[PDB]
Design a protein around this ligand. Structure first.
Ligand code: OGA
Ligand code: OGA
Ligand code: OGA
Ligand code: OGA
Ligand code: CL
Ligand code: CL
Ligand code: CL
Ligand code: CL
Ligand code: CL
Ligand code: NI
Ligand code: NI
Ligand code: NI
Ligand code: NI
Ligand code: ZN
Ligand code: ZN
Ligand code: ZN
Ligand code: ZN
Lengths: 347, 8, 342, 13, 348, 13, 345, 8
């Protein structure tokens, strides 16, 4: 509902494209971060892989069938594990008459069908598959080696976590989706669409994110009492109509093949896949994320929930505040509009 | 199981 | 045998104690009255009999693998997925099942409660304490002890063992016959009622046809996908396509007998506990030979019929081994043992 | 994965 | 004056003499064969009851018996323990294995000694009392299925059949399986035909000395005789031939080869064992001479379901003269075990 | 119990 | 020590707590022989009289036929007509079945192994019932209150003879074959009245040897079933154990005396004359491992199996997942006593 | 019948 929280898309030059962290700083100087979601179109000359011809034999070890229950625009999604399969088998199912994309004339019709048939004919989503489709030598925006301060966790403490500091492959089909969530530890996210049908995203500006979770708490009270950050479980789906009804601002955007998508700290997002496709994703950070990580509210009802130590980041970047924070008396309040400090060159 | 796509 | 129970309706029996004492003889008797033609029958034991003095010492019982029943579908066509949950005691289950979130909605008549079930079974998925190895019968009970029925099924010695089912509102069981088209016995120890739907075995094929029409992918995947017990079909669909069926509500203290090749389904009204097992009679042997089994995985229930063919049909053993034993089952005919009643 | 339980296929993660 | 020594006789009927079973029984009895209580008949070489025996491997034996024996010094008791049904091919597999195969020996006396020595050890299984026939339908000569004997009246009148008496029985034998001292039910006639396999050895006590055996048996099993009037009809009592020698019971022994018939005559006590894997078919039958035997037969009194044939129809149809006397418990007629069957008049 | 066949007493359990 | 069978004479105060006293005798090494005798206080009586049990029914008496030679025998239990205790007593004390004349135990044992295949006697085994009076709270076989009860408390399943009491009416020459308890459980046996019951025990430490020996002497049986001794049909004479070096001990149980078998303790025996014993299985924490490792009969579906899930998770949480995964590799040292015995050491 | 005292 806010003009200044609106999703921006960018068309960098090759020269601009070669330095990732700098260009992230640049889009923050343009206000992109304020929408919680930015789209980056890479130059025509850039290809992360010569061909996708050699992936049909690839294995999806733990495919999931997404059963959805709910009504009146509120839903809960249960991920049921399925037998491992290859991308060939998965492709057979994805283009089948039962699971193929429905016929439509405009995007709005496909959105209507998505929210209309969400709970019917549950699709299989090949989510969370370890791997990268980048060629190892490619230095331009290689999700496998993004080289940003997040590496402190692996370089400073040698801790390996799937998806956050390692690349993740997502093989989608029609009606597969991701619930309303922010990254673990409220980090940044990078998502590249290698090939296939589009993926559509809903975004809520971080400035209003608290409102959203407040609303969520009200509509899933029994879930909220068990865990305050129950949205971290990525099981809650909320419809655009319901956001408008309760005055939550949001934007939407459609991501096509060969395009990049960036989520910014504390930017709630959800979405769904138009058809058979493949994406590669990881998390990343800037200096501005540090405060976000210090104040991140996490799930406390799971053993394996992602909890990262912020000690080293503070010591390396906020020494003047370190001992006070480790003391626990640090009450700095975040301003979501502020671009990252690495935009000094800009601004 | 706990995985990033969510609770499994 | 076609004269008995021509309508193929569900029959309810009221044996005396004298009649009750011999389980297999009473099964043969109810078949001599044509009960089996319905695929489902109800036995009401005499008020004097009790399997257990009280059900107030069962809180420590454990449900190792409770399942949450997520149901997806519309227009009377649904697919149920049972998700394994954390173990819990009967006491915990009783607390949850009585909670305002899961408790039995308010209704006056049965038709209203059924309506709510078919309207809301997709929402607020419930928890079912099913497939629990155990028993609530006291050790000394020798009448109709689901634990040790001692039918010819024991010649294979899973199937002849007792199971417990702790139900809450709108937990349900999908359309199915028994593994190997066996018999089943169900006793409701306590709690809210359990409603059933049944198709006369004579008309079972029609159900299968209709089911294959509604889930073609499942039918291509598997010959007997109903054996997965994930398929739910409302009575309004059955009646919409001319399929004969009947309904019965089982109360606490009542027995339900399902007969070979009798498709049944249903749902629980609220918190209750039932005990059940599979069993056989001589009449089941042919059904066991002609049963169409699940093909798509290794751990589907399969019983070798060789032992039964040797003991009860020696003269046909050779014929049966050569694949030349094509004999037609007459569903109306009662079990051989029923001769003394016919 | 899945298990063939009595009440049908049981889904366990 | 015919076969005064009561020794087991063998007959070699021509195919012509083979046509009428009852007639040839009359003949062998006209020769004194019945005095031994057991006879052997060798059918003509050209005769065959069954063209081939290779299509029976899947025949089901419903109640195999594991034959457990206890005893010492030539006295033994046999308990038959039921086992689960098995096919003929499984039975033959077990019979020919090392565990149960026939031991290698030089002469018959060696196998007889080893049988009596090892009788209690390594109990064999006996495929006994199997309902069925291996006769082909078209065989009109000596068909155990349809012997056309006066005994067939029992079914015709009462309408009740007695398995193994009015109907055929099959026996699949292995080494050391044995049948205990006994006479046929109601003291009837017996017919046994060895279809294939190893031989079957028999011991036979002539009817004229049956009582002596009985006396001896009661002395050696006093408790059993207290419990029942005819405990030998339980078919559990085994008595070695050396015990019979020691106590003066006359007997003879005979070995039946494949393709051969053995006839047991009324009140002729017999026993024996099988050398190895074999198959025999058997049933009961009767002649006029049997009627008197069946009237005075002493039956098992400790069981309600023992074989009992009503004699009233036989007496009414063949003994009009004494239905009144016998029916009034006054027919004191003695039985001469020597005398042949009436039907032997045409030969005597 | 016991069942009396033509071959004698047969003992079944 | 010497792994010989031990006998204990508790005070009434010691006797009151069953599990505690079991733990004590194990703290004394009683469990190494595989068999221990407990003599109860003289004052203690389980039943006021044994005159009102004459019309008790023995549903399935078994006649024990034995075949074999040279100390190796196989036993076959043939079911007979049901009879009352009175009829059984009359048969057992009759001349045909009564105990031969003997002067010392060694002679009677000699006569047993000599006459084992002759004059098969009738054994009134496996009779559901108890002879304890209703309010006897000490050493009551019906309600021993050990951790074994957990299974029934969680599922309600009961196995007769394991979780419930069995009565055995014996006569001369009736015998029980070499065996361990189902699931390698503990056993408690009490002789109510009548003539004595003789026992042979092999120490658990040497259990495997006995199995090897049995397997060698009954090769076919061992091919069919992994644990063929669990059919309880194999009898082996003491002479044959000595010849092949199996260490064993013997002991005779008298009326009013308790016998306790310990996990993986192979034992066999025979009755001297007409008598009545009551027994059942029980467990301790030490048993849990034994149950996890027990080699069970593989040829029959009707055989006794107990799920250890409840035991492992409640008493061995640390290994549960590992165990459930199948990765637990604990080696049982049969020398060690029960945990609950800590208070004595 | 599977019994404790052995195979009956
Ligand atoms: O691809 C998906 O299903 C979900 N992706 C994300 O939430 C992301 O890339 O940040
Ligand atoms: O009780 C249930 O949930 C299912 N019952 C049956 O399918 C039955 O008893 O045959
Ligand atoms: O074949 C057997 O085992 C026994 N036969 C007979 O006793 C007979 O034929 O009369
Ligand atoms: O008493 C018997 O006959 C047998 N007893 C046992 O094997 C025992 O108590 O462990
Ligand atoms: Cl909620
Ligand atoms: Cl209750
Ligand atoms: Cl489908
Ligand atoms: Cl005697
Ligand atoms: Cl062997
Ligand atoms: Ni995300
Ligand atoms: Ni059912
Ligand atoms: Ni005979
Ligand atoms: Ni024992
Ligand atoms: Zn949580
Ligand atoms: Zn299937
Ligand atoms: Zn008798
Ligand atoms: Zn076994």
């Amino acid at each position: 509902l806010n003009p200044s929280a609106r999703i921006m898309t960018f068309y960098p030059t090759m020269e601009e494209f070669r330095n990732f962290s700098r260009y992230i700083a640049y889009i923050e100087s343009q206000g992109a971060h304020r929408a919680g979601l930015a789209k980056v179109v890479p130059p025509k000359e850039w290809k992360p892989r010569a061909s996708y011809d050699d992936i049909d034999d690839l294995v999806i070890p733990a495919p999931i069938q997404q059963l959805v229950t709910g009504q009146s625009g509120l839903f809960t999604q249960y991920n049921i594990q399925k037998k491992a399969m290859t991308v060939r088998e998965f492709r057979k199912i994805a283009n089948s008459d039962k699971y193929c994309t429905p016929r439509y004339s405009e995007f709005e019709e496909l959105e209507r069908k998505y929210w209309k048939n969400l709970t019917f004919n549950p699709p299989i989503y090949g989510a969370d598959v370890n791997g990268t489709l980048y060629e190892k030598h490619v230095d331009e925006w290689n999700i496998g080696r993004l080289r940003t301060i997040l590496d402190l966790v692996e370089k400073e403490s040698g801790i390996t976590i799937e998806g956050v500091n390692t690349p993740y492959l997502y093989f989608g089909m029609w009606k597969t989706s991701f619930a309303w969530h922010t990254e673990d530890m409220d980090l940044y996210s990078i998502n590249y669409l290698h090939f296939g049908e589009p993926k559509s995203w809903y975004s809520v500006p971080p400035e209003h994110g608290k409102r959203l979770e407040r609303l969520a708490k009200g509509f899933f009270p029994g879930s909220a009492q068990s865990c305050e950050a129950f949205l971290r479980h990525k099981m809650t789906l909320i419809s655009p109509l319901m956001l408008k009804k309760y005055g939550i601002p949001f934007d939407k955007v459609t991501q096509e093949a060969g395009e990049f998508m960036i989520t910014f700290p504390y930017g709630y997002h959800a979405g769904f896949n138009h058809g058979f496709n493949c994406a590669e994703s990881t998390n990343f950070a800037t200096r501005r994320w540090i405060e976000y990580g210090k104040q991140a509210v996490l799930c406390s009802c799971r053993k394996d929930m992602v909890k990262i130590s912020m000690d080293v980041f503070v010591r390396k970047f906020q020494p003047e505040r370190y001992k006070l924070w480790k003391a626990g008396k640090d009450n700095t309040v975040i301003d979501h509009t502020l671009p990252t400090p690495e935009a000094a060159e800009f601004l | 199981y706990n995985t990033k796509s969510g609770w499994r």
